[PDB]
């Protein structure tokens, strides 16, 4: 029996209001700017590299991915803004690698492809970080992965950042071994020459496909062999699809053109013999009752103005149906249950500065969801944190610890979205990047940093004032603005969404309009991994 009608969230924002107009204009400006940049990134290494790559007869990586996936299906690229102005003068579109999740032969699987157009497929440090992030996502979600190797090797001028360290290059192979150990499939496809970077990968993978001419599997390149052993020989003699197939046996299959390799890959995936099963109650799904684009006028591009979360929730969940939990108590925070694309979810969001009561409410909600095996989604807009003499007297920090412990010990899949400004230890509290959320995204407006620039400028001013007063020449009235200005500027630069997305702190920058769609895709993939028991540490009263 499901005949009871339920109240729906959200209202109709006043379009005629000048505030809505202003917010809309700001959000359009940001979205347009993002779109133009993404176009320029997708062009890749540049026209000349494309001309040469075509001249060899290979297919450009974007074309390869389009042919590989089940046609007419969505594909979810990740961290497209990697390496955006990260290095001093070297243009590295997309980090010289394309990674994503797609549906192939009816089974979700992660695709990782080199981009030989960009810098000959050399592994920049960011490239390794991006690839490892993809692999860990696949393992947690328990998804098969496919590699499309056209890489040369590690970037020589930066060897310290690539080779030695634990999380550095080579950890890739370790993950590969662990994946194959616990039945997660591995497939490697070779389209280009490889020198010790794409040489172990086919040997490391269970299955192997190599194109007849353009594919060569060799541990040491012809220049490396010539320089090291004093002997020169073409990589085909060390590599080659036919040469390796007849005698070496490294290649399990022998393809002629790029299309043939893709088709064979589809056949292998079908033969993989895996079936997905769910363990959560499912229901029919319906669209939210309100248009999504209104969010622009609701949110704007200023962190100062405040927007109620429930408006956004109405714009997202199925049918705009929501059941708030302990609404009156701890109003600064919002929790409740909802359904997205027929899947149950628990929504946690921020309205204002946290207090002790909000922390207690969040802890109780987390326990409930973990007990009932319900996925969790976080919408954090932490304009301020819990600071105050009365607050610390009653151990508001202790309540914050309760947030941290509950979030950390949780085992159900967790997804986080940074709708608004994130600062302070609340990032740790509301399932930050460090707390291993399955995904993480940021809207084009959000700014993330440890503290607002003004706060740090004031704090530094005071500490210098106190110590220099102890030194006899206190921080003078002059230099106050001179000292403050650089701190504000630097914090602004480090808080920019592109700046963080240049590194891999986030999985991607998404416009608000696409939000709903992305979430559904993510949750579907996350459901592949079976749910497990959640065990909690000591709950300090």
């Amino acid at each position: 029996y499901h005949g009871d009608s339920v109240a729906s969230l959200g209202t109709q924002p006043d379009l005629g209001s000048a505030l809505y107009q202003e917010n809309y204009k700001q959000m359009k400006a940001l979205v347009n700017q993002l779109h133009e940049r993404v176009e320029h990134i997708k062009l890749g290494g540049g026209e000349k590299a494309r001309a040469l790559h075509i001249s060899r007869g290979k297919l450009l990586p974007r074309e390869r991915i389009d042919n590989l996936i089940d046609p007419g299906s969505p594909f979810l690229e990740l961290s497209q803004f990697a390496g955006y102005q990260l290095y001093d003068n070297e243009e590295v579109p997309g980090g010289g690698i394309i990674t994503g999740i797609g549906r192939v032969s009816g089974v979700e699987c992660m695709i990782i492809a080199n981009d030989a157009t960009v810098k000959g497929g050399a592994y920049y440090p960011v490239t390794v970080k991006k690839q490892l992030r993809a692999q860990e996502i696949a393992m947690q979600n328990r998804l098969p992965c496919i590699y499309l190797v056209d890489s040369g090797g590690a970037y020589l001028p930066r060897q310290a950042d690539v080779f030695p360290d634990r999380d550095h290059f080579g950890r890739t192979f370790y993950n590969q071994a662990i994946m194959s150990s616990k039945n997660i499939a591995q497939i490697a496809v070779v389209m280009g020459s490889c020198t010790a970077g794409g040489a172990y990968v086919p040997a490391m993978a269970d299955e192997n496909i190599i194109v007849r001419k353009q594919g060569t599997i060799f541990l040491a390149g012809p220049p490396l062999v010539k320089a090291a052993t004093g002997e020169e020989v073409s990589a085909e003699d060390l590599g080659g699809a036919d040469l390796h197939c007849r005698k070496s046996g490294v290649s399990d299959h022998w393809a002629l053109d790029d299309h043939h390799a893709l088709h064979l890959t589809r056949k292998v995936v079908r033969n993989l013999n895996y079936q997905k099963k769910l363990d959560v109650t499912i229901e029919p799904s319906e669209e939210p009752l309100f248009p999504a684009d209104e969010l622009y006028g609701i949110v704007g591009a200023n962190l100062k103005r405040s927007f109620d979360v429930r408006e956004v929730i109405a714009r997202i969940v199925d049918g705009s149906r929501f059941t708030e939990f302990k609404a009156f108590y701890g109003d600064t925070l919002v929790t409740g249950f909802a359904r997205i694309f027929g899947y149950p979810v628990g929504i946690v969001g921020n309205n204002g500065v946290l207090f002790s009561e909000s922390a207690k409410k969040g802890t109780h909600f987390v326990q409930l969801c973990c007990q009932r095996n319900i996925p969790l989604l976080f919408l954090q807009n932490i304009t301020g944190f819990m600071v105050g003499r009365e607050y610390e007297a009653e151990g508001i920090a202790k309540d914050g610890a309760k947030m941290v412990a509950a979030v950390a010990c949780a085992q159900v899949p967790k997804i986080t979205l940074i709708i608004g400004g994130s600062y302070g230890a609340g990032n740790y509290g509301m399932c930050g990047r460090a707390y291993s959320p399955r995904f993480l995204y940021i809207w084009p407006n959000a700014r993330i940093s440890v503290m607002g620039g003004e706060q740090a400028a004031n704090v530094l001013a005071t500490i210098t004032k106190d110590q220099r007063a102890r030194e006899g020449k206190q921080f003078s009235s002059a230099d106050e603005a001179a000292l403050k200005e650089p701190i504000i500027k630097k914090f602004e630069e480090e808080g920019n969404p592109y700046y963080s997305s240049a590194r891999v702190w986030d999985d991607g920058i998404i416009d608000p309009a696409d939000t709903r769609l992305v979430l559904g895709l993510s949750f579907s993939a996350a459901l592949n991994a079976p749910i497990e028991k959640t065990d909690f540490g000591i709950f300090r009263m």
Partner: protein, 214 residues
């Protein structure tokens, strides 16, 4: 003509979407957004390019999966604004679609390698490509020349130095140490020459008869 090519190209997607839909129905989870045939990427408009056989000339059609569900295809600098659907009258399915504001209904019978458009004014014949690797021509290109699997005494050779080669004809009969096996002609091209004479022995993976390039 140009619109007709677009109409068939739409039909392939609709049939493919429906068959994509069918496998979803038998599956456990028929509710995921993945089952949607939207073909949408993140922040990018997905585009796939076709090739369809049109009598003598092949035509390349560029299909951009538009954001709203409309369908955009372009052939020789002419674009076409296409929206369509599939509905079945009786047991036969009709294709109803509008191309640049002009709509019509036509029977869509789809064979293994041919496209059928049936209408009152006439019919249109479009042919889908066949991949060369699936065409088994690639199978004969896997091996450049014949190879003897095992070393053995060649009793006698059925083909002379210059001789016509037929499909299925045996190059020679080679018997060795509790085994006789019969070697065939790898390709129908006329033999350039025969490498091994009568009574000779060739090792594993060794050429046996030279053949002219096909």
């Amino acid at each position: 003509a140009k619109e007709s090519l677009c109409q068939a190209a739409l039909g392939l997607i609709l049939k493919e979407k429906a068959m994509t839909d069918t496998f979803t129905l038998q599956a456990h989870d028929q509710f995921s957004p993945f089952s949607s045939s939207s073909g949408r990427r993140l922040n990018i408009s997905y585009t796939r390019n076709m090739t369809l056989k049109d009598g003598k000339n092949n035509v390349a059609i560029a299909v951009t999966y538009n954001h709203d569900g409309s369908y955009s295809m372009q052939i020789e600098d002419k674009t076409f604004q296409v929206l369509g659907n599939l509905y079945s009258e009786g047991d036969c399915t009709y294709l109803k679609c509008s191309v640049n504001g002009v709509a019509s209904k036509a029977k869509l019978i789809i064979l293994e390698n041919t496209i059928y458009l049936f209408s009152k004014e006439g019919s249109i014949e479009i042919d889908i490509p066949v991949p060369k690797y699936l065409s088994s021509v690639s199978s004969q290109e896997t091996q450049g020349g014949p190879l003897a699997p095992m070393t053995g005494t060649i009793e006698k050779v059925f083909v002379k130095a210059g001789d016509k080669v037929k499909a299925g004809d045996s190059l020679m009969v080679m018997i060795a140490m509790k085994m006789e096996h019969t070697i065939k002609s790898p390709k129908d091209g006329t033999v350039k020459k025969v490498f091994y004479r009568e009574g000779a022995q060739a090792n594993r993976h060794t050429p046996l008869v030279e053949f002219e390039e096909e």
